């Protein structure tokens, strides 16, 4: 992981680790949530800490925080790959992948498909039954 990304994830961690001791406590997390309009109980805060606290000592340290942030970054990079794929297929940018668009891009990607093959692919994905693949449908097929 790049040191630029570490410094970035450190700035994020510092929003929770409000005193820079290197740990996020339930008390700190309580202040965070209160600052955003909630008023959590000790139990609720222990639950939230436990989402990230890998060694179960009841606090989150920066290595545990960074493990979580790196997993989320891989999720966001996957999501961005699928979003870019949708833009490439949606040649005219109207939010729908048509059969014509699917066939034309597949040709460019080294896969020559016939009409019936393309139509079967659209039916597999076309949850709402309108004959085209919108972004929501695409995500469902691609995840």
């Amino acid at each position: 992981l790049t040191e630029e990304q570490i410094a970035e994830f450190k700035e994020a961690f510092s929003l929770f680790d409000k005193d820079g001791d290197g740990t996020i406590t339930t008390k700190e997390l309580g202040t965070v949530m209160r600052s955003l309009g909630q008023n959590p109980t000790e139990a609720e805060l222990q639950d939230m800490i436990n989402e990230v606290d890998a060694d179960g000592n009841g606090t989150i340290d920066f290595p545990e925080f960074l493990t979580m942030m790196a997993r989320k970054m891989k999720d966001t990079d996957s999501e961005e790959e699928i979003r870019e794929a949708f833009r490439v297929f949606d040649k005219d940018g109207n939010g729908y992948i048509s059969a014509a668009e699917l066939r034309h891009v597949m040709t460019n990607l080294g896969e020559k498909l016939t009409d019936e093959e393309v139509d079967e692919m659209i039916r597999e994905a076309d949850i709402d039954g309108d004959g085209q693949v919108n972004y929501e449908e695409f995500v469902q097929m691609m995840t």
């Binding site: 794929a85 597949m106 460019n108 990607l109 896969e111 692919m121 994905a125 691609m142």
Partner: peptide
Amino acid sequence: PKFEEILTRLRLQ
């Protein structure tokens, strides 16, 4: 053709 290849193909392109 599964959609997973189409993602892989796109990545190479």
